[PDB]
Design a protein around this ligand. Structure first.
Ligand SMILES: [Zn+2]
Length: 401
C-alpha cells in the first residue's frame, strides 16, 4: 500500500494510478521517441508532463552508455544494473508519482506546478519573422497502438539518471542561434532524477547523520525548470557555485547576489518579454497546426501575463511582470519548500554531502505524502527522527561515502 490518496477519492495532480505493465494506449501510456533511438515506454502524468522510467542514455549523444569512467569525481555513484527490471521501473513510476503529490499537497507546490504547466515553450521556430512556428525540439513523437506517430508539444520530462546515478539536473535541447533558456522563449525541460536514492548531511540537533527528503531535491530541479521554461535562467558563467544555484536554493544564500545585479537581470528579461510581445504583434501567419493565429497568440498572452488593448495589440505590464518574475525567482526556492514541508535540510547550498543512501518511499509505512519520513503519531515524528539515518536505520541503506 502506497498511500497515494491520503485525502479524497483520487490523486489531485497525477492523472492516473499507473502500473508499469499497464498496456500502451497512445494517449497517456505510449512508446515515444525524442527528436536515433528505440521507442521507450512513457507515462503522461499531467497535461504537458511525461515520465520515462528508463536510465537516460538518450538526451546526450556522448552519454549513450552507463559505463563509469576510469576512477571519477568524489561525489558520484555508479550501478549499471539500476532501473533495468520492470519491478524497478514500476517502483520508479510510483515514487515519482508520490513526490509530485507531496509537492502538490503544499500551497507553494500548487503555485509552482501551475506555473510550470502554463509555461509552454514559445513558438519562435520560424525563419520568417511574421510566421509563428513550433520548435521541433519542444516536442516528442507519441506512437499509437496501430503504429502511427503524432507530434506532441510538452513542457517537462522526468527521466532516470545517466551513468552517474546521483547527478541530478534539469537540461534541455538547444537551438542553432537562439538561447531558449535566457531569451524569454523557454524550451522543454528534461529532469534527470531518481526517487530511489538520497543524500546525507550532518546536523547537530553530538552531530546527527540525516538524509535529505527527496521531495525537496525534486522541487529544487522543478524550480530550475520554471526558470528555464520562462527563459529567465541566469547565465551559467555568473558564478564554483553559480548565481542560478544560489537563487534556486534561496534563503540567506540568495541574499549574496547583490541587489543592483538583480535589478539588471530583471531589466534584461523585462526587455526580452517586450521583444516577445512585438513578435506576437507582428505575426501574420501560423504553420503547425489547425489552430488559428489568434488562438496561439492568446496561449502566450496567458503564459506571459500580457496586456491586450482594444486594438488587440499586446504589451508587457510592469506590475504583472514584476509579480511573475518575483514568483519564479524569489518565492519558488528550496528554502521555502523546506519551510512548507517542515523537514530538516542543509542550511546552505555550499554544504558538503557526506553519503549516498538507497531508499524506498513507495510503501506508506516508510514515507507519506503529508509527513515524508517523519511519520506523525510515532517516534519518527519528533526531532526529525524519520530523517535520522541511525534512528530510522531501516529506511536508509548506506551505499557510499
Ligand atoms: Zn541546482
Amino acid at each position: 500500500s502506497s498511500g497515494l490518496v491520503p485525502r479524497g477519492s483520487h490523486m489531485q495532480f497525477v492523472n492516473k494510478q499507473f502500473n508499469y505493465k499497464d498496456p500502451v494506449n497512445g494517449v497517456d501510456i505510449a512508446y515515444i521517441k525524442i527528436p536515433q533511438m528505440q521507442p521507450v515506454k512513457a507515462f503522461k502524468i499531467h497535461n504537458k508532463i511525461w515520465v520515462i522510467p528508463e536510465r537516460d542514455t538518450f538526451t546526450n549523444p556522448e552519454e549513450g552508455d552507463l559505463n563509469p569512467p576510469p576512477e571519477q569525481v568524489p561525489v558520484s555513484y555508479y550501478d549499471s544494473t539500476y532501473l533495468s527490471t520492470d519491478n524497478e521501473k514500476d517502483n520508479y513510476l510510483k515514487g515519482v508519482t508520490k513526490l509530485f503529490e507531496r509537492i502538490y499537497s503544499t500551497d507553494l507546490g500548487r503555485m509552482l506546478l501551475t506555473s510550470i504547466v502554463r509555461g509552454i515553450p514559445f513558438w519562435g521556430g520560424s525563419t520568417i519573422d511574421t510566421e509563428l512556428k513550433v520548435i521541433d525540439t519542444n516536442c516528442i513523437n507519441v506512437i499509437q497502438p496501430d503504429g502511427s506517430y503524432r507530434s506532441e508539444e510538452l513542457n517537462l520530462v522526468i527521466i532516470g539518471p545517466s551513468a552517474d546515478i546521483i547527478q541530478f539536473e534539469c537540461k534541455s535541447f538547444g537551438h542553432e542561434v537562439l538561447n531558449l533558456t535566457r531569451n524569454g522563449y523557454g524550451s522543454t525541460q528534461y529532469i534527470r532524477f531518481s526517487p530511489d536514492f538520497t543524500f546525507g548531511f550532518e546536523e547537530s540537533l553530538g552531530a546527527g547523520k540525516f538524509a535529505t527528503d527527496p521531495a525537496v531535491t525534486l522541487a529544487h530541479e522543478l524550480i530550475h525548470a520554471g526558470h528555464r521554461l520562462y527563459g529567465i535562467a541566469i547565465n551559467p558563467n555568473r558564478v564554483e557555485v553559480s548565481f542560478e544555484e544560489l537563487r534556486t536554493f534561496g534563503g540567506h544564500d540568495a541574499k549574496f547576489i547583490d541587489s543592483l545585479q538583480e535589478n539588471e537581470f530583471r531589466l534584461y528579461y523585462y526587455n526580452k518579454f517586450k521583444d516577445i510581445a512585438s513578435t506576437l504583434n507582428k505575426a501574420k501567419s501560423i504553420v503547425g497546426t489547425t489552430a488559428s493565429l489568434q488562438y496561439m497568440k492568446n496561449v502566450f498572452k496567458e503564459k506571459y501575463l500580457l496586456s491586450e488593448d482594444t486594438s488587440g495589440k499586446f504589451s508587457v505590464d510592469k506590475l504583472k511582470f514584476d509579480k511573475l518574475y518575483k514568483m519564479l525567482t524569489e518565492i519558488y526556492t528550496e528554502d521555502n519548500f523546506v519551510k512548507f514541508f517542515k523537514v530538516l535540510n542543509r542550511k546552505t547550498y555550499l554544504n558538503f554531502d557526506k553519503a549516498v543512501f538507497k531508499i524506498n518511499i513507495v510503501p506508506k509505512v516508510n514515507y507519506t505524502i503529508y509527513d515524508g519520513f517523519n511519520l506523525r503519531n510515532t517516534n519518527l515524528a519528533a526531532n526529525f527522527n524519520g530523517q535520522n539515518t541511525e534512528i530510522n536505520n531501516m529506511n536508509f541503506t548506506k551505499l557510499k561515502n
